Design a protein around this nucleic acid. Structure first.
Ligand code: 1FZ
Ligand code: MN
Ligand code: MN
Ligand code: NA
Ligand code: NA
Length: 326
DNA sequence: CCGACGTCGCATCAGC
DNA sequence: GCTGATGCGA
DNA sequence: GTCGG
């Protein structure tokens, strides 16, 4: 954490441009610069040194100079005491609330935590639940708790159909000592790129995980993606565990490796990999890696049978999950 | 300079 | 009801 | 905001 103050500054700038300015690319530029600096093994002595890194240009270099000299950045000081910006930035932290909904909520005077509670009738379902567990969602999950949840999910899954395979991707698979949520890839042999030989495949798993009071809430649900809330069971006389966000993704069994690559992350690592795939003339999603034609239009799925195979096509040495934490 | 910036799932709304 | 765009999220 | 070309 050598360059902690800097990466925080850029991350805060990223949040600003996303939530307030609604400038998504600026937001990704800051997050990209913060990431490349995050894994820079030196304590940066000057902006020009940082400018030697990709994703770090003139404007950020100048801001880094200002930060390194004063210990602060004036643009952020101004933003911090801007009440509208501070209000919008806050509302966006509630799940289901983005820059647009936050901005309009502020136009109605709804700009604090109680504002959201007394005006509960103005939220859709996602925002209602996202506010219901705002406090709990702020807490991280120690890896120890992640391990408990994986036993439950994997065993409950086993009980519905023993051919379900369930893998816990996300930062957990990246070996993080603490995660922000739980991410689960799911594969049943009846669901391939060829056919859905069984309906309700994901529904029945959600159903089972609700029966055991593991999944307490749903933010959204489809035939391939679930977004909701879970909770570890506490013993007698114990304070309850915080409610945890959970994501479940049903991906066609034969397209597992593109799926496990996608959901393992990190999100930036992905964005850099897929952007590199393009420069090599490939396009990767959670399903397939495919070549790009002479006209841009992608061709047929190339054969993939390992995580490493996808790294090969784009001329990248395989990086274990632990090393994708950009 | 400038075009492009990973890719896609669900909720939701506009328009028909 | 559907198609496509938009908002928010993975 | 950055950068390839
Ligand atoms: C949010 C998000 C996720 N993803 C992919 C990569 C993430 O690793 C994976 C899971 O989403 P997440 O749980 O929001 N990210 P996380 O598991 O990497 O980090 P954390 O430990 O939950 O905070 O999905 C993207 O590719 N773009 C995104 O914007
Ligand atoms: Mn996660
Ligand atoms: Mn997640
Ligand atoms: Na640079
Ligand atoms: Na949000």
């Amino acid at each position: 954490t050598l360059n902690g103050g800097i990466t925080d500054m850029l991350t805060e700038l990223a949040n600003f441009e996303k939530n307030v300015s609604q400038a998504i690319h600026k937001y990704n530029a800051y997050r990209k610069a913060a990431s490349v600096i995050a894994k820079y093994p030196h304590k940066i002595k000057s902006g020009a040194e940082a400018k030697k890194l990709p994703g770090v240009g003139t404007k950020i270099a100048e801001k880094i100079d200002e930060f390194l000299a004063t210990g602060k950045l004036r643009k952020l000081e101004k933003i911090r005491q801007d009440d509208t910006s501070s209000s919008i930035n806050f509302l966006t932290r509630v799940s289901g609330i983005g820059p647009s909904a936050a901005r309009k909520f502020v136009d109605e005077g709804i700009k604090t935590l109680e504002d959201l509670r007394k005006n509960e009738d103005k939220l859709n379902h996602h925002q209602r639940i996202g506010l219901k567990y705002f406090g709990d969602f702020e807490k991280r999950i120690p890896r120890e708790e992640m391990l408990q949840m994986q036993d439950i999910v994997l065993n409950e899954v086993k009980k519905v159909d023993s051919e379900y395979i369930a893998t816990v991707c996300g930062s957990f698979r990246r070996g993080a000592e603490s995660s922000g949520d739980m991410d689960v890839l799911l594969t049943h042999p009846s669901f391939t790129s060829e056919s859905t030989k069984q309906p309700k495949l994901l529904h029945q798993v959600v159903e089972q995980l609700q029966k055991v009071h593991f999944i307490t809430d749903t933010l959204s649900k489809g035939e391939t993606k679930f977004m909701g809330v879970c909770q570890l069971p506490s013993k007698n006389d114990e304070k309850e565990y915080p409610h945890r966000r959970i994501d479940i993704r049903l991906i066609p069994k034969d397209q597992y490796y593109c799926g496990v690559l996608y959901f393992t992350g990190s999100d930036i690592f992905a964005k850099n990999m897929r952007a590199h795939a393009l420069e090599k003339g490939f396009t990767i999603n959670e399903y397939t890696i495919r070549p790009l034609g002479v006209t841009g239009v992608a061709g047929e799925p190339l054969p993939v049978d390992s995580e490493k195979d996808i790294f090969d096509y784009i001329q990248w040495k395989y990086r274990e999950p632990k090393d994708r934490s950009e």
